[PDB]
Amino acid sequence: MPNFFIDRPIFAWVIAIIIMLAGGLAILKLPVAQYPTIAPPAVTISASYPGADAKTVQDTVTQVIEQNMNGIDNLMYMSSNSDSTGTVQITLTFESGTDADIAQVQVQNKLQLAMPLLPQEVQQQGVSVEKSSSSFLMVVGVINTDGTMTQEDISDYVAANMKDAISRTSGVGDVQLFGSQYAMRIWMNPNELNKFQLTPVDVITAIKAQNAQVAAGQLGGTPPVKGQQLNASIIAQTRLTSTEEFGKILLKVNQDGSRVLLRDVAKIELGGENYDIIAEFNGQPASGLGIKLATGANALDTAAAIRAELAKMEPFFPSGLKIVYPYDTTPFVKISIHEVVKTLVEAIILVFLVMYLFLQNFRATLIPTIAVPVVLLGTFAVLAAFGFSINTLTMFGMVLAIGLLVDDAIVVVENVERVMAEEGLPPKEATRKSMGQIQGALVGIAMVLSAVFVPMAFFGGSTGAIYRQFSITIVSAMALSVLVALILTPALCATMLKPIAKGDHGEGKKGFFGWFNRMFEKSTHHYTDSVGGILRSTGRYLVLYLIIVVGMAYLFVRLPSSFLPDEDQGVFMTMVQLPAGATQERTQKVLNEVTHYYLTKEKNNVESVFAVNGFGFAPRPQNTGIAFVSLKDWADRPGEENKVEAITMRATRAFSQIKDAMVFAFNLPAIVELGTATGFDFELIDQAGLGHEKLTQARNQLLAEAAKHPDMLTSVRPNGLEDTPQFKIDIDQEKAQALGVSINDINTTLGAAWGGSYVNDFIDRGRVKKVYVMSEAKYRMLPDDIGDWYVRAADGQMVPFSAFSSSRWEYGSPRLERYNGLPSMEILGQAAPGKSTGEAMELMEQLASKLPTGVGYDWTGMSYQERLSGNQAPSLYAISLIVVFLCLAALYESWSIPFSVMLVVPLGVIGALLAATFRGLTNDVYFQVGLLTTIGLSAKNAILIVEFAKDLMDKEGKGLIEATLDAVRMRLRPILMTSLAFILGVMPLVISTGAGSGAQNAVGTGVMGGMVTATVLAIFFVPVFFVVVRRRFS
């Protein structure tokens, strides 16, 4: 193939052009996003039951829905929450590769047929079925600075005059409103109701009758009286549009003629649907939009478009309303691309300088400068073909591959420059002979590197999806690089390189380049002399090799494990947790102290504090709060003291002083769905209908036993809420029936007044919104208020609740968990310092087998996937080694020689481990892919030395030591060239302190260190391996 394109350099140029156009075309069209789809497809069923307790929700909604989630394809597991905020959320997680649209439609279809079994109140609210996602493109915050608007006022404006326009914006998928639009709030007064002998039942009955769309008919409708001139629509009663109209709703006319209106027995205003969640931004009332990126959309374009649309809304905003950006991934993604384009340009600049330093002619330096960009562009086209996206994983995949792409260019050109210098052949015949020596090796190298990276794609679960991004990116880049090195690079060498005189090693020249050539030629003779001495005392170096392999194996265990490094993203959470029974106000006081701390003590670091009272990552009780701290840009807070790590520790420590509250700050992970690598996700399950209380006791027993193994388990804690005091009220049926009070009127009066009741809809300024009747706060606060509520008997007498009710305190769950239909309790924890995640799990299983009868267990999330993806790891490692061996065996035509190459693996890994250990990094994904690129390149070096060594012995009939020494001499310059360029090329990534530098460090550090040792050791050890292997097997 190289011979073909040496004679046909225009054909070669055509392929280069077609590849470049395909690549440029792909770059313009390729989607852009921080991360691709990693987590398996999940679907969340969400419902609301206004004024419902966890138990009420579970036993009327959660269980009914769960019981009907049958005949749905590719379901792995199912989990649900039922809490006292009147919310249920059932999450169905599916097999990786499941069509999320088919997954969702099958779920909502099974729900649709379960709807008639849910309460009226829940059916009326609606039950949402959405594709699960914790990854937003950005969070657009909407705040009021001049204190003219409440959070309810802002939310309503955003719902009406922003959300839809943002929803219609280019590349915008989902848009969540942070709050609700207005509702017609009827605030009933029980004293006024009792005076007119009225109840919430009357208020509801009246609102339903006097706020409704009533169908009349038509004037002159078909079939008409023939001769009819007119056909007009009859508009009868329509929905009310204002508080004034709701005020005038007639409840009763008295005996004396005077009229009782709804305003006489209730305060009437536009309010929020929910008052549980209070959102603030630097103390100021705030709403906002949670924006997610649409499938195959450009994160940079979508963000710009969202900003362009918000700019066009600026002129129509009420006074005091401002737009803020507490969370935006675009700044990160933009830097991620610039730092990669920088790396790929710097790489080419460094190759030019190295190529010139050694070969000392500009014509030679142009060949890699053409060949590399062509391969890179080509890769983008092949990424587009496979349906991949420009993202953190695929971009750093190319950064790790630049070593392999630069080598292919250097290896081909350098070998032509040598063959010309040593045999004084013209560029054309020199290229033919040069390619003749390496063409077979380059094919063998492709197959070997394919066998290294392709099996990495066939890992399962979330980790499988991540490894696959790197796998297909590096395989594609490397595969094109080989095709280019067999098509283009030869053709360029044969036509662009100028002739070199036989025995012209550049020692005749003067200046710096003349000095360097005579200095390098001397250094080459020293190297061959050194290898000569090494090959005399092989036994000693085999012992020094086994030390490195032990040192490798040692550091591999000592080095901590992770999926992705914890990077400073410019945001972090601060949990606020008050005691059981704590109110919304009490929680706000602590949030104000948390907000005050960050805005004063972290004035130079913190930009905004988004304090959400009655919220975690879902609606929580009044006793729970959370603050999303948005930091200033990394450039405005230098050093390591002004990073999340330090700020978190300082804040967490400072908040220890706070009493009647439990406040702690913590970073969010790289990707939400990974958690921690050491961390496990345990589900304690009620398998025999034991009950909540007996499952609580069994959990406490497991939590206690886990604490008695600090050597194996760390922070074994429940991911759930503890039982809280709740007000059990018993309606006496006998006293109710004796007083002629209907149980329906009692339970309506209680629920409507105390819990609130969604009555029907009304149109506010052309928008349909909910009507809510509820007690004015002051009449539904304490148990003493229960007796102030009166129900009308059959004989028209008003009976107080106190007359037919008795109350007591009990304990119950404000959040009931279920896993695969059965009652569950989620337990979090991690393997103790120096222990594997698999060991910690094995003990958790052991401790669980000693729990009361009927208490089972199961693994979920990362634990479920770690068990499955961990099972197949051995097989892939094996298949990788077997195919690599077999490929080298075909290349060399011997079962023995392959070992000479395969023995190089540790020489690269040792330096990566030392560099990572010294630096204080982790055995993360970027590091592991870095190891494979280091192993691959060091394997490539070895393959070429051994190929040259064997070919000298086979064809020119040279001796083992002679051929080996002659081989390593010829291969020194190209190995030192590639190494010098690639080590300098990743130097900026190791020192990088700025944005997304955690990934850069993880990539560069384990690559630089790996290359330094791989280069230094390989040049001395590869000749040993070849000589020892060729000796043992005649």
């Binding site: 005691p579 059981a580 029974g581 704590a582 009493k659 406490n700 005091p725 006496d732 006998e734 006293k735 148990p783 008795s806 109350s807 007591r808 305190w809 304990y811």
Partner: protein
């Protein structure tokens, strides 16, 4: 500080932490938002050892919540025979009435706790005690259809 740590420990059933807290001088009259003392919680969750340890550390045996319920109510209602005896020993008002007029006998009868009803009766529980609805422990036993309990209260 120690009071809120005792409330949690007394409810969790951590005998060792309660012992340490009794030594450090943790408040045994400490109450949650609803007015439940460590004894209330210990009586509810059936932690016998802590009830004994709390009472000998001067815990109010006739402490009541904001609805008038005493630890004996919570113990008699949730079927904790041993605690009902230990409380009654340490001078627990056997005829104690909450704001509904409900007595430990009413609650014990309600949940059909045979042994506990006899203990309360041994310690002189007013069998004719009526709640706000004029209902005795017998009226409850007849309505629940508990033939044994009905026989005991006659």
């Amino acid at each position: 500080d120690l009071g809120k740590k005792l409330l949690e420990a007394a409810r969790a059933g951590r005998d060792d932490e309660v012992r340490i807290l009794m030594a450090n001088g943790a408040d045994v009259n400490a109450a949650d938002v609803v007015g439940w003392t460590p004894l209330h919680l210990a009586a509810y969750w059936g932690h016998l050892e802590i009830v004994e340890v709390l009472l000998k550390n001067g815990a109010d045996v006739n402490a009541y919540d904001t609805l008038g319920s005493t630890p004996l109510h919570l113990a008699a209602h949730f079927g904790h025979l041993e605690i009902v005896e230990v409380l009654l020993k340490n001078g627990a008002d056997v005829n104690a009435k909450d704001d509904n007029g409900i007595t430990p006998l009413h609650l014990a009868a309600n949940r059909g706790h045979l042994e506990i009803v006899e203990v309360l009766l041994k310690y002189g529980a007013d069998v004719n005690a009526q709640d706000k609805f004029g209902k005795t422990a017998f009226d409850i036993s007849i309505n629940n259809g508990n033939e044994d309990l009905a026989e005991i209260l006659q």
